[PDB]
């Protein structure tokens, strides 16, 4: 499992042409903000490949 390379699986905003986003804010899947506890409808924005 290659841990150095990652990618963004899901995001709440559509990235415009030639626009990057290095922020790792926890995405909220339409619920109360979980303050980043990775529980109810809140997951990490990035995802590791292999």
């Amino acid at each position, epitope marked *: 499992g290659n841990y150095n390379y990652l990618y963004r699986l899901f995001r709440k905003s559509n990235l415009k042409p030639f626009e990057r986003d290095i922020s790792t804010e926890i995405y909220q899947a339409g*619920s*109360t903000p*979980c303050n980043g*506890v*990775e*529980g*109810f*409808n809140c997951y990490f924005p990035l995802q590791s490949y292999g």
Partner: antibody, heavy 119, light 112 residues
Framework: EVQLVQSGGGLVQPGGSLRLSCAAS????????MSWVRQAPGKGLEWVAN????????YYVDSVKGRFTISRDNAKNSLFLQMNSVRAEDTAVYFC????????????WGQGTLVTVSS | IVMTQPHSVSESPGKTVTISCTRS????????VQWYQQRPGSSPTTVIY?????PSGVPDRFSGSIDSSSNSASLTISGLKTEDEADYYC???????????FGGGTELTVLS
């Protein structure tokens, strides 16, 4: 019908050890789980420990792991709880309640004993 | 894991007040969500169990339900009166380390 009473509280300085006792009368003391519940003055309920039927399997929460020793006795149908190395945050009202089944709620509670740690 | 619960909420006597016990990092369909009731200066007692069955000795007012759309529970208390002024709690076997987490504790008052 079931009667659950406890006594033996008080208050001492940190570093010592205390022990509570809860009897049982009105049900078979062989097929019912036991679990202690504490309630600090002004704070909500919490969980302390849970013992198996015979007394083999024991589980405690991380905050009270090690410093608490729960052990029941089916001979005289009694329950004991000796907690050494007490501290300030251990001040609460410890209840002894019988559990209907493991994956369920508690049926009958105790009466309450104010146990504070200050001398 | 923490059972989120409001500190205090009430309404005028005669309406229907509900209490939420939303969990933190546990599936709502894991185990049963129960509710308790503690009077000031006494020991708590069980008011509901299995989120759908009512113990013998409770009037036909407390009605529990389950809302899987937000992983939370509720309790429809119909006919709010003076005897409902108590402290309710919650319970659910939510954890892979054999630990029970209780609710926060709502201080239901009489807004008369």
């Amino acid at each position: 019908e079931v009667q659950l009473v406890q006594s033996g509280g008080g208050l001492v300085q940190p570093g010592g050890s205390l022990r509570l006792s809860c009897a049982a009368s009105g049900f078979t003391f062989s097929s019912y789980w036991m679990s202690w519940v504490r309630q600090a003055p002004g704070k909500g309920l919490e969980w302390v420990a849970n013992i198996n039927q015979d007394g083999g399997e024991k589980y405690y929460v991380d905050s009270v792991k090690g410093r608490f020793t729960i052990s029941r006795d089916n001979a005289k149908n009694s329950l004991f709880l000796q907690m050494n190395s007490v501290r300030a945050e251990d001040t609460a009202v410890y209840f002894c309640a019988r559990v209907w089944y493991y994956y369920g709620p508690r049926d009958y509670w105790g009466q309450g004993t104010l146990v504070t740690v200050s001398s | 894991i923490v059972m989120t619960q409001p500190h205090s909420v009430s309404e005028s006597p005669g309406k229907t007040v509900t209490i939420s016990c939303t969990r933190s990092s546990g599936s709502i369909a894991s185990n049963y969500v129960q509710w308790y009731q503690q009077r000031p200066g006494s020991s708590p007692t069980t008011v509901i169990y299995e989120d759908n069955q009512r113990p013998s000795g409770v009037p036909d007012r407390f009605s529990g339900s389950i809302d899987s759309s937000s992983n939370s529970a509720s309790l429809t208390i119909s006919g709010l009166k003076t005897e409902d002024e108590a402290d309710y709690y919650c319970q659910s076997y939510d954890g892979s380390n054999h630990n029970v987490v209780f609710g926060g504790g709502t201080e239901l008052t009489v807004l008369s």
